[PDB]
Amino acid sequence: GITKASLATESFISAASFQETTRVLTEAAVAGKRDELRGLKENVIVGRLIPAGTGYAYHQDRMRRRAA
């Protein structure tokens, strides 16, 4: 479904800012999860440039500069 596929995401902040926070946070804590900030809600919450519009060039540069 829409809700069940939005709650099952690799990123856990884009799922914890969705409906249920206690369950998502407990599972992501026991699993030792790691959020790599690839979507739009993660970069909105953190307060940086969205990877979609005018920030796409910036995010491409930050990606290619990494490990190179």
Least distance CB 13 / another protein (angstroms): 9
Query: Contact between 63 and another protein (CB under 8 A)?
Result: no
Distance CA 68, CA 3 (A): 38
Least distance CB 47 / another protein (angstroms): 5
Could you give the C-alpha distances from 38 to 4, 23, 32, 67, in angstroms and in order? Answer: 20, 22, 18, 17
List residues near another protein by CB under 8 A: 2-3, 5-6, 14, 16-18, 21-22, 25, 29, 40-41, 44-50, 52-56
